[PDB]
Structures are given as C-alpha cells and as structure tokens.
Short mmCIF file of C-alpha atoms in Angstrom, two decimals:
data_model
loop_
_atom_site.label_atom_id
_atom_site.label_comp_id
_atom_site.label_asym_id
_atom_site.label_seq_id
_atom_site.Cartn_x
_atom_site.Cartn_y
_atom_site.Cartn_z
CA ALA A 6 -6.09 -12.67 -32.63
CA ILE A 7 -6.06 -13.62 -28.90
CA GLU A 8 -3.78 -15.70 -26.91
CA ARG A 9 -3.18 -16.44 -23.17
CA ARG A 10 0.45 -16.00 -22.46
CA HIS A 11 2.73 -16.07 -19.43
CA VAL A 12 5.58 -13.87 -18.42
CA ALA A 13 8.36 -14.11 -15.76
CA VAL A 14 7.91 -11.27 -12.91
CA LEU A 15 9.98 -10.99 -10.01
CA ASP A 16 10.00 -14.28 -8.08
CA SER A 17 7.23 -15.96 -10.19
CA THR A 18 5.15 -15.65 -13.30
CA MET A 19 2.12 -13.92 -14.30
CA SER A 20 -0.60 -14.98 -16.90
CA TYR A 21 -2.25 -12.55 -19.12
CA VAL A 22 -4.65 -12.35 -22.19
CA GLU A 23 -3.40 -10.32 -25.04
CA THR A 24 -5.17 -9.42 -28.34
CA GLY A 25 -1.96 -8.19 -30.14
CA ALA A 26 -0.63 -5.31 -32.14
CA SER A 27 -2.89 -2.49 -33.03
CA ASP A 28 -2.72 0.97 -34.35
CA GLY A 29 -4.94 2.02 -31.29
CA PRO A 30 -3.77 2.51 -27.72
CA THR A 31 -2.92 -0.21 -25.43
CA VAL A 32 -5.61 -0.90 -22.87
CA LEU A 33 -4.98 -2.60 -19.71
CA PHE A 34 -7.62 -4.42 -17.99
CA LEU A 35 -7.36 -4.74 -14.16
CA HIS A 36 -9.66 -7.23 -12.08
CA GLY A 37 -10.28 -7.38 -8.38
CA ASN A 38 -11.28 -10.01 -5.90
CA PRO A 39 -11.55 -12.89 -6.36
CA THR A 40 -11.78 -12.85 -10.17
CA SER A 41 -9.25 -12.85 -12.99
CA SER A 42 -8.82 -11.73 -16.60
CA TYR A 43 -11.78 -14.22 -17.20
CA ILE A 44 -14.21 -11.44 -16.02
CA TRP A 45 -13.31 -9.41 -19.13
CA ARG A 46 -13.94 -12.14 -21.44
CA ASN A 47 -17.34 -10.67 -23.09
CA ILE A 48 -15.93 -7.04 -22.98
CA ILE A 49 -12.51 -7.43 -24.66
CA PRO A 50 -13.95 -8.48 -28.06
CA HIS A 51 -15.61 -5.07 -28.17
CA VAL A 52 -12.43 -3.16 -27.40
CA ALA A 53 -9.92 -5.40 -29.60
CA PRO A 54 -10.68 -3.81 -32.76
CA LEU A 55 -9.70 -0.45 -31.42
CA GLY A 56 -6.59 -1.12 -29.28
CA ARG A 57 -4.23 -3.72 -27.95
CA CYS A 58 -5.94 -5.34 -25.06
CA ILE A 59 -3.86 -6.86 -22.18
CA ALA A 60 -5.66 -8.38 -19.17
CA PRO A 61 -3.41 -9.87 -16.49
CA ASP A 62 -4.12 -12.18 -13.81
CA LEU A 63 -2.91 -10.51 -10.49
CA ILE A 64 -0.45 -12.49 -8.69
CA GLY A 65 -1.96 -15.46 -6.88
CA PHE A 66 -5.19 -15.11 -9.08
CA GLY A 67 -6.04 -16.82 -12.35
CA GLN A 68 -3.21 -18.74 -14.02
CA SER A 69 -0.59 -16.54 -12.23
CA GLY A 70 2.15 -18.02 -10.07
CA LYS A 71 1.55 -18.57 -6.42
CA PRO A 72 4.54 -17.41 -4.61
CA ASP A 73 5.14 -17.39 -0.85
CA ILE A 74 4.15 -13.69 -0.14
CA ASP A 75 1.64 -11.77 1.86
CA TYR A 76 -0.59 -10.79 -0.98
CA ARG A 77 -0.95 -7.37 0.46
CA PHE A 78 -1.77 -4.34 -1.79
CA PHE A 79 1.72 -3.30 -1.88
CA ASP A 80 2.72 -6.73 -3.23
CA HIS A 81 0.17 -6.47 -5.87
CA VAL A 82 1.60 -2.98 -6.75
CA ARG A 83 5.03 -4.49 -7.05
CA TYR A 84 4.02 -7.35 -9.19
CA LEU A 85 1.96 -5.19 -11.49
CA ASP A 86 4.75 -2.71 -11.99
CA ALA A 87 7.10 -5.53 -12.83
CA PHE A 88 4.54 -6.98 -15.29
CA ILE A 89 4.33 -3.71 -16.94
CA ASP A 90 7.96 -3.37 -17.28
CA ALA A 91 8.44 -6.95 -18.58
CA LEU A 92 5.99 -6.42 -21.37
CA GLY A 93 7.50 -2.87 -22.25
CA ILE A 94 3.88 -1.21 -21.81
CA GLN A 95 4.18 2.48 -21.84
CA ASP A 96 1.27 4.83 -22.76
CA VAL A 97 -2.07 3.07 -21.43
CA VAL A 98 -5.75 3.37 -21.13
CA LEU A 99 -6.76 1.54 -17.87
CA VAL A 100 -9.83 -0.37 -17.37
CA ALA A 101 -10.60 -1.43 -13.85
CA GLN A 102 -12.84 -2.68 -11.29
CA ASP A 103 -12.65 -3.52 -7.51
CA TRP A 104 -9.02 -3.62 -6.34
CA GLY A 105 -7.95 -3.19 -9.99
CA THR A 106 -9.10 0.51 -9.41
CA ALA A 107 -6.85 0.99 -6.47
CA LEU A 108 -4.13 -0.32 -8.52
CA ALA A 109 -4.89 2.02 -11.45
CA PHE A 110 -5.00 4.95 -9.11
CA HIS A 111 -1.90 4.41 -7.70
CA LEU A 112 -0.16 3.72 -10.86
CA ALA A 113 -1.65 7.19 -12.38
CA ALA A 114 -0.48 9.02 -9.14
CA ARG A 115 3.20 7.85 -9.60
CA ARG A 116 3.12 7.86 -13.62
CA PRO A 117 0.67 10.32 -14.81
CA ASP A 118 2.57 10.74 -18.04
CA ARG A 119 1.69 7.40 -19.23
CA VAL A 120 -2.11 7.36 -18.39
CA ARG A 121 -4.11 8.22 -21.27
CA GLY A 122 -7.57 7.43 -20.03
CA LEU A 123 -9.47 5.47 -17.44
CA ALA A 124 -12.63 3.42 -17.47
CA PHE A 125 -13.74 2.26 -14.03
CA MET A 126 -16.46 1.11 -11.79
CA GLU A 127 -17.19 -0.19 -8.48
CA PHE A 128 -14.01 1.24 -7.05
CA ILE A 129 -11.85 1.47 -3.78
CA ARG A 130 -11.97 4.72 -1.79
CA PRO A 131 -10.97 5.29 1.92
CA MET A 132 -13.99 4.72 3.90
CA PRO A 133 -14.18 6.62 7.36
CA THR A 134 -16.67 4.37 8.91
CA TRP A 135 -18.36 1.01 8.25
CA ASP A 136 -21.42 2.77 6.78
CA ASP A 137 -19.19 3.83 4.20
CA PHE A 138 -18.44 0.17 2.88
CA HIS A 139 -21.08 -1.20 0.73
CA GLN A 140 -24.72 -0.44 1.13
CA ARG A 141 -26.41 -3.51 2.85
CA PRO A 142 -26.00 -4.21 6.44
CA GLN A 143 -25.72 -7.98 6.24
CA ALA A 144 -22.71 -7.38 3.74
CA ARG A 145 -20.93 -5.05 6.35
CA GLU A 146 -21.31 -7.82 8.93
CA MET A 147 -19.76 -10.34 6.57
CA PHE A 148 -16.81 -8.29 5.66
CA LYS A 149 -16.57 -7.57 9.45
CA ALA A 150 -16.08 -11.33 9.88
CA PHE A 151 -13.59 -11.65 7.05
CA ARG A 152 -11.41 -9.01 8.76
CA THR A 153 -11.57 -11.02 12.05
CA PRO A 154 -8.71 -13.23 12.78
CA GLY A 155 -9.59 -16.81 12.83
CA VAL A 156 -13.18 -16.35 11.60
CA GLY A 157 -11.98 -15.21 8.17
CA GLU A 158 -9.62 -17.92 7.76
CA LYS A 159 -12.54 -20.37 8.39
CA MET A 160 -14.91 -18.66 6.01
CA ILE A 161 -12.50 -17.86 3.16
CA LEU A 162 -9.71 -20.55 3.36
CA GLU A 163 -11.60 -23.42 4.79
CA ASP A 164 -15.27 -22.86 3.26
CA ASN A 165 -14.20 -20.82 0.18
CA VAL A 166 -17.20 -18.60 0.66
CA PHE A 167 -15.75 -15.63 -1.15
CA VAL A 168 -15.51 -17.60 -4.46
CA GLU A 169 -18.61 -19.85 -4.14
CA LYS A 170 -20.99 -17.41 -2.44
CA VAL A 171 -19.90 -13.80 -2.53
CA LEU A 172 -18.91 -13.82 -6.06
CA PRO A 173 -22.26 -15.19 -7.61
CA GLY A 174 -24.06 -13.21 -4.95
CA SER A 175 -23.19 -9.90 -6.55
CA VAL A 176 -24.11 -10.82 -9.96
CA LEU A 177 -27.75 -10.51 -10.85
CA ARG A 178 -27.79 -13.22 -13.49
CA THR A 179 -27.02 -16.72 -12.53
CA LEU A 180 -23.47 -17.75 -13.40
CA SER A 181 -23.44 -21.01 -15.04
CA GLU A 182 -21.81 -24.15 -13.50
CA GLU A 183 -19.03 -24.00 -16.17
CA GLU A 184 -18.38 -20.47 -15.36
CA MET A 185 -18.20 -21.22 -11.69
CA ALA A 186 -15.77 -24.02 -12.40
CA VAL A 187 -13.46 -21.42 -14.20
CA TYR A 188 -13.76 -19.05 -11.25
CA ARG A 189 -12.98 -21.67 -8.55
CA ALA A 190 -10.01 -23.35 -10.85
CA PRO A 191 -7.29 -21.00 -9.13
CA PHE A 192 -8.40 -21.66 -5.56
CA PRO A 193 -8.49 -25.68 -4.92
CA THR A 194 -6.87 -25.55 -1.42
CA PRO A 195 -7.13 -23.36 1.81
CA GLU A 196 -3.42 -22.32 1.03
CA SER A 197 -4.17 -21.18 -2.48
CA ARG A 198 -7.01 -18.84 -0.96
CA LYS A 199 -4.58 -16.63 1.01
CA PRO A 200 -4.77 -13.77 -1.61
CA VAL A 201 -8.61 -13.82 -1.47
CA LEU A 202 -8.56 -13.45 2.34
CA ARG A 203 -5.87 -10.83 2.50
CA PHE A 204 -7.75 -8.46 0.09
CA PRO A 205 -10.74 -7.80 2.48
CA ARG A 206 -8.14 -7.04 5.29
CA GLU A 207 -6.57 -4.47 3.01
CA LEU A 208 -9.68 -2.41 2.67
CA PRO A 209 -9.11 1.11 4.24
CA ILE A 210 -11.93 1.18 6.60
CA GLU A 211 -11.95 3.37 9.78
CA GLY A 212 -8.35 4.32 8.79
CA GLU A 213 -7.07 0.85 8.94
CA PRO A 214 -4.79 -0.48 7.74
CA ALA A 215 -3.33 2.91 7.94
CA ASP A 216 -0.61 2.32 5.32
CA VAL A 217 -3.19 1.52 2.68
CA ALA A 218 -5.42 4.35 3.69
CA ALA A 219 -2.57 6.84 3.22
CA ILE A 220 -1.72 5.52 -0.05
CA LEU A 221 -5.22 5.53 -1.44
CA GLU A 222 -5.99 8.87 0.03
CA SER A 223 -2.99 10.39 -1.88
CA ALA A 224 -4.08 8.27 -5.08
CA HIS A 225 -7.43 9.83 -4.91
CA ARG A 226 -6.07 13.49 -4.42
CA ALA A 227 -4.12 12.79 -7.78
CA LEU A 228 -7.08 11.32 -9.43
CA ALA A 229 -9.28 14.53 -8.47
CA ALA A 230 -6.63 16.66 -10.07
CA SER A 231 -5.93 14.67 -13.18
CA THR A 232 -7.22 15.84 -16.54
CA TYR A 233 -7.19 12.78 -18.73
CA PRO A 234 -10.68 11.27 -19.94
CA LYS A 235 -12.53 9.15 -17.82
CA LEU A 236 -15.54 6.85 -17.84
CA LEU A 237 -17.37 5.80 -14.72
CA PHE A 238 -19.67 2.98 -14.95
CA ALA A 239 -22.36 2.33 -12.25
CA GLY A 240 -25.20 -0.02 -11.35
CA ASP A 241 -28.31 0.23 -9.41
CA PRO A 242 -28.02 -0.35 -6.55
CA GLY A 243 -24.43 -1.32 -6.97
CA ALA A 244 -22.38 -2.47 -4.21
CA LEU A 245 -19.09 -0.45 -3.15
CA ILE A 246 -20.66 2.71 -5.12
CA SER A 247 -24.43 3.75 -4.80
CA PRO A 248 -25.93 5.70 -7.89
CA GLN A 249 -25.80 8.90 -5.80
CA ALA A 250 -22.21 8.53 -4.95
CA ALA A 251 -21.27 7.61 -8.48
CA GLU A 252 -23.12 10.75 -9.82
CA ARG A 253 -21.48 13.14 -7.23
CA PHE A 254 -17.93 11.46 -7.95
CA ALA A 255 -18.22 11.88 -11.64
CA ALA A 256 -19.36 15.33 -11.26
CA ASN A 257 -16.51 16.45 -9.23
CA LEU A 258 -13.85 14.63 -11.39
CA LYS A 259 -12.46 16.28 -14.38
CA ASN A 260 -13.35 15.02 -17.74
CA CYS A 261 -15.36 12.14 -16.53
CA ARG A 262 -18.64 10.92 -18.18
CA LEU A 263 -20.96 8.75 -15.89
CA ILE A 264 -22.69 5.66 -17.48
CA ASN A 265 -25.68 4.37 -15.39
CA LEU A 266 -25.85 0.91 -16.68
CA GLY A 267 -29.33 -0.07 -14.94
CA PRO A 268 -29.83 -2.82 -12.58
CA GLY A 269 -26.44 -4.28 -11.26
CA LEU A 270 -24.52 -5.13 -8.23
CA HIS A 271 -20.72 -5.39 -7.77
CA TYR A 272 -19.48 -7.67 -10.71
CA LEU A 273 -21.03 -5.42 -13.47
CA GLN A 274 -19.12 -7.14 -16.37
CA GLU A 275 -21.33 -10.22 -15.75
CA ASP A 276 -24.60 -8.17 -16.19
CA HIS A 277 -23.60 -5.60 -18.77
CA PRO A 278 -20.75 -6.66 -20.89
CA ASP A 279 -22.17 -5.35 -24.39
CA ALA A 280 -22.93 -2.10 -22.76
CA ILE A 281 -19.61 -1.72 -21.00
CA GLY A 282 -17.60 -2.95 -24.19
CA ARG A 283 -19.45 -0.87 -26.77
CA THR A 284 -19.19 2.29 -24.62
CA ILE A 285 -15.36 1.81 -24.04
CA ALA A 286 -15.31 1.24 -27.88
CA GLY A 287 -17.12 4.45 -28.55
CA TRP A 288 -14.86 6.34 -26.24
CA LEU A 289 -11.59 5.13 -27.37
CA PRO A 290 -11.49 7.16 -30.53
CA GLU A 291 -11.77 10.39 -28.16
CA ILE A 292 -8.29 9.35 -26.77
CA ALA A 293 -6.70 8.57 -30.04
#
C-alpha cells in the first residue's frame, strides 16, 4: 500500500510518496538539500503500519516540478503550505532533517494547533559565527565558497559537487552506484541545480541573510515554548549538530527525548534507517 503521486501546487506540481489511509496519525516527512522523499525509503516501512505516511519532494527536488522561481526558503514555505492545503492535511506528526527542520519549525510556529509531534535530526538554527556552522574547518571553507558569487555557481551548477561529493561524503556507508543515480536524477543540467545552490546561501550565518535569520529565530522561540512530544536523533560526530549540542538542546526543550544513534554524519537516514524507523514506530503510540 504505497504509491508515488503528483499534485498541482501553485504554478507547478509536487511529487510525493503516500502509504494511504490509516487509523493512526498522518506523518509528514521533510527532506533537505540535495535529497528528496527517496531518503526516507528505508524508514517509512517502519512507520506505515502505525500511520499514514506522506513524503513530498520539495519544489525543484526529486520528481517535483521545476518552476522559474528563486527557490529561497520562503518559496519552499509557500509551496509546502500549498501542498499541505492541496492534500487536505490537518493534524500532523512531522519527521524532518536539514532544511526540512526549518520548514517544520516555521510551520509549527504559525499552526501549533496542527502539530502533534516532531521527530527531527541535523536541524537548522541561527548561527552567530562560522564556528557555529558544522564541526570541521574544511567544511566551513567549502560552504563559504558555495556562498560566494561565481564560485558557488561553478562548484554547484557546473560541477554538481553537492550531489556528487557532499552528499556521499556525509554518509558513513558507501552509497551504491544505483542509489547515486537516483540522487543525481533530478539534477541533469546546471539550470536544474539552482535550488541546490540557493539553499546554502539561505543558511542564517552571522545574521545573513537577515530575513531567514529573523524567521528562524522566531521559529526557535516557538519551538522552545512548545509542549508537543519530540524526538531528537543525533549521530557522532554528526555534522550540523555535535553530540554535546544535541544533549543540551534536547535537555532544554520540553517533552523531548534524545536518541544517540552512534557513528554518523549528516544524512543519518542512510546509516541508521532501522533505528530511526523503529524508534519513531515505538514513539507514535505515545502520540495516539
């Protein structure tokens, strides 16, 4: 009982995977850069017996449409909101990673009524300095380059380094040639890679861009006050989130359980699908 579908959204379409009607909650899975619903493929089967799983491809990613837009964070907000409306999704449990977490936090800040729980990992937070981005200095230098005009275009649009090198580089196991062919499929041309280049330029680092920084600071205030149940997964060493930062974050949030998965980098779904899926499955009955 699983299907890839498409739905008209604003000026385009979005693709999504759906497991269909369930007596349990609706569970909305949100990927980040430069992945798609595909990253949840080994996790969703653990959750499907307990809830209706919906995993969209963000606009410009996966099998979603490629409209002529900027692909800013605010564009993703609008397309995801319209996706939610088009499917009639109401109460939801959010499962999110990377930019999917920023979308989840901003959704919960505006519509707290609807958010019944949040399982998250490797999340976006305002970063006052570059030392607050990532944990390895060579990664900081690379993302500084992505954020530099001209240089980032060459690296991401022309050479496709985010898909071809950064993605497999932040998985401990080796992604197979067939897995990489799926991950590369949305991005055959420099033009198609525009969303992949815009995302790192949206990261709120040193207060810039100021519009994203302010919106995510507000979303984090709402998250800190919120009372819905939460699961925070973390790897060692992780990438955006160190083990120490994850422990402090989960300790300070309300109703938040920390799951230390063990050795892992950024794309934790690729190294720990059973642990993530089984843990979410065991936690959903607390929500219902």
